[PDB]
Amino acid sequence: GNPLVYLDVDANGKPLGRVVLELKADVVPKTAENFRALCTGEKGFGYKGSTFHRVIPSFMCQAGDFTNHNGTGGKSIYGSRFPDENFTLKHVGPGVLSMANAGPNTNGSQFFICTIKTDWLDGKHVVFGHVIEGMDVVKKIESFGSKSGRTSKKIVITDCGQLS
């Protein structure tokens, strides 16, 4: 079936716990495979040791810039960027996992977990999964954000990988 992956997250060097994500490879196989491989690190790069750099309360928590740590970087397993696969899954509520981007067809490695329904992103960001376990961890992360997105704690993905 669809991959299950995990992110273990610290804030200021102390563990918050684990976020488990289901990747909808049935719907968006290319987007799911990218995220899966960046969690395992099997291509020689990926999310381990990187940060949630942009966190906005009552919106979303964004991570995945493992090259520049600030929203300008990241890369996919295919190359620097890859196309929008489809917009079939929608931003229906808290727990949606979706690709951050810089306009059409600019997916790399940055992603976000919604903490509300973000319907205005439908047709603009590729949704590719959702939180299975660990919304409590997501709410902790969210609480360390700000309106500007700047975090008030250093929020690090210390470990990540594939469960199934």
From Swiss-Prot:
Listed result of changing residue 160 to S: Blocks Ca(2+)-induced mPTP opening and reduces hydrogen peroxide-induced cell death
One GO CC term, this protein: mitochondrial matrix
PTM annotation (N6-succinyllysine): residues: 24, 43, 132, 147
The protein's assembly and partners: Associates with the mitochondrial membrane ATP synthase F(1)F(0) ATP synthase; the association is increased by inorganic phosphate (Pi) and decreased by cyclosporin A (CsA). Interacts with ATP5F1B; ATP5PD and ATP5PO. Interacts with SLC25A3; the interaction is impaired by CsA. Interacts with BCL2; the interaction is impaired by CsA. Interacts with TP53; the association implicates preferentially tetrameric TP53, is induced by oxidative stress and is impaired by CsA. Interacts with C1QBP. Interacts with MCUR1.
Shown part of the complete sequence: 44 to 207 of 207
Keywords for this protein: Acetylation, Apoptosis, Isomerase, Mitochondrion, Necrosis, Rotamase, S-nitrosylation, Transit peptide
Similarity field: Belongs to the cyclophilin-type PPIase family.
Protein name (database record): Peptidyl-prolyl cis-trans isomerase F, mitochondrial
Record's subcellular location: Mitochondrion matrix
Molecular function GO terms recorded: cyclosporin A binding; peptidyl-prolyl cis-trans isomerase activity
